[PDB]
Ligand binder design. Sequence first.
Ligand SMILES: Nc1ccc2c(NCCc3ccccc3)nc(-c3ccc(N4CCOCC4)cc3)nc2c1
Length: 328
Amino acid sequence: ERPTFYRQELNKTIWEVPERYQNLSPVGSYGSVCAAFDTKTGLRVAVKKLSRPFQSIIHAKRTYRELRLLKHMKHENVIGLLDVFTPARSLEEFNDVYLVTHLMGADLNNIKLTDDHVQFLIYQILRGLKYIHSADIIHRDLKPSNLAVNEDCELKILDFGTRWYRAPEIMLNWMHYNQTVDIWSVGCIMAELLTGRTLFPGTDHIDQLKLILRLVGTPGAELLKKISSESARNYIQSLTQMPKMNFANVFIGANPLAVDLLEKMLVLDSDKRITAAQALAHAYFAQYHDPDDEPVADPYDQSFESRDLLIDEWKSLTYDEVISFVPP
Ligand SMILES: Nc1ccc2c(NCCc3ccccc3)nc(-c3ccc(N4CCOCC4)cc3)nc2c1
């Protein structure tokens, strides 16, 4: 059942892929990516050749992690795995991994948008996040360039886990953050789509926190009550007490429902931040929300993350995942 492969060089890089995929066009560079034509399905795909996937234990575990995540994602607003292949015929010669995904038109970084456009884009991000989060997965690095959009405005999240979109508790190095670090990111993205301007374009990590605190205000007593780190509490009590800004004044002219949702996403205290599922129910998405079509994910076994294995063992687990792959 093994297909016939064909070879070619692209940007000082040889590509060995099933004849199924045709007209490989480089799209730039973790991995080299080519645009291609899937003759089996008539669709345009992206083919990613991982670079040095098994170079070290850290790379090998990262390769396995990326394959396991992509094999799990089955949702309209999350990038899924169409195919995965290696030219190798055995574990012994297994050295290269190629991942095949839907070719998306552009990303949000390249795409000021109308409020109706922002509504539909953020709705789709949140629907994808509800699904990812329901599997106990956190994206951790959501940003416009990790959001693919086609000309129909259909959106998919990709490239799971720049400082401009990171939750303050990650900036301050909290070990026990929750899934709503991603909701902070969505809030930064949505703000940028509405205004045309990065919300918090910090020049470094200290400037980044200062910009965030200027908007959302310095932590309240209820939040300090929950801070364990001794420095963190002094640092918080030490810097100039900014007052929380009225978001309606900052996002002047925006739809009041958008301002209200932003207020619920950009909360400094992550215990109080809105979840993806809750945000889908916000009135801002009234014309798109469908509680019967915002599904959750099957459970995802992340137990491998806590394991310390040899480089060859991670490579063998990755090989098993290539062989066991079942296309959609
Ligand atoms: N229940 C909650 C809710 C929120 C929380 C939150 N939010 C970050 C708040 C913040 C305040 C000012 C500037 C940036 C972020 N932050 C931390 C937190 C932040 C940093 C640490 N450190 C890092 C230094 O080494 C000791 C451990 C430990 C805990 N806990 C929270 C617990």
